[PDB]
Amino acid sequence: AMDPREVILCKDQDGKIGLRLKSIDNGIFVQLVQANSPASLVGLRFGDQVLQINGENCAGWSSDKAHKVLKQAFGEKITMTIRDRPFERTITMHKDSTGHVGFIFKNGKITSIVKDSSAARNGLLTEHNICEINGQNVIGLKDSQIADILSTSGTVVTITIMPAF
Amino acid sequence: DPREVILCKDQDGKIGLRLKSIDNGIFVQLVQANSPASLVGLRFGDQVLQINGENCAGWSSDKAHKVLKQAFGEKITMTIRDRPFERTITMHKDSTGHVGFIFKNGKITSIVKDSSAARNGLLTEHNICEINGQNVIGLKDSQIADILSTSGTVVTITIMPAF
């Protein structure tokens, strides 16, 4: 759907980028993006795949290797080839009489499925992070804020999710 | 998006299926060739949302097998969601005519340095499901290799995490 795209960025005054990368299946993934950082400024998100760092393929790099590669890098014009959230998946649920789609969450992660709900009928999975509800990003938000977003939404609740890491 | 399918139990009271409990959901792990499941279009990695109008959410691998074993009569209803963990990746063949991955039993086991698989971030422990639209699950490695060589420079494949 989205072919890998190019991203260029600079280390901040403190020498940081705002990224925390995770090694999954001989590929590198964005595990954390600090707010108001170079990573967030260029559009990096939790779930994005880092294919290349400075023209070098990241295939089979350990997490510590990726972090050290970024540490040693020249603080200016750090390039990257990103593959937008490969494990992302969309699921549409419907609110019941009581105004709920039927699942429990903790730190933005789905923890349980309520019996006879839209989450149960649609097959929502547990141990999945909620990325976006009806278009707005919910990563980094407080649980109370996700709950507020869910109540202001209409009957049709379309969420994007991905396996947790 | 999901679809309702209707199966008929075979000669032995079996449906030709094996299911796996992944993250409080039910998934098709194996489909036997020429069986009631194969006929309706059930494939590996498909999600079983309901059996006989019952939400499969939370069911163990054992519970879902028991439900099917002790199912009432000849006809069985199922609500299915087509391969949720399916993802499509595109590679390009080099001078030697290769994209850069080693596979065994239809599963990607290694990525070759300085290749299109490496550049594209292709993941290991992933089953290949389709090569240029053509299904490859059930096929022997040589038939998969044969279809890989038949393709042009552009190799588009669908894959899913191995389970």
Ligand SMILES: C[C@H](NC(=O)[C@H](Cc1ccccc1)N1Cc2ccccc2C1=O)C(=O)O
């Ligand atoms: C996604 C949303 N879930 C919730 O309304 C649940 C509360 C709940 C409602 C119905 C059945 C069972 C539990 N919350 C709301 C909430 C707020 C803060 C922290 C955690 C939670 C939580 O699990 C929904 O399914 O509509």
Ligand SMILES: C[C@H](NC(=O)[C@H](Cc1ccccc1)N1Cc2ccccc2C1=O)C(=O)O
């Ligand atoms: C996808 C395809 N891969 C293969 O031709 C690999 C061997 C290979 C040759 C050269 C470079 C990288 C890997 N096969 C082909 C094959 C046939 C039967 C059993 C195992 C294998 C196997 O690992 C390609 O790279 O275009």
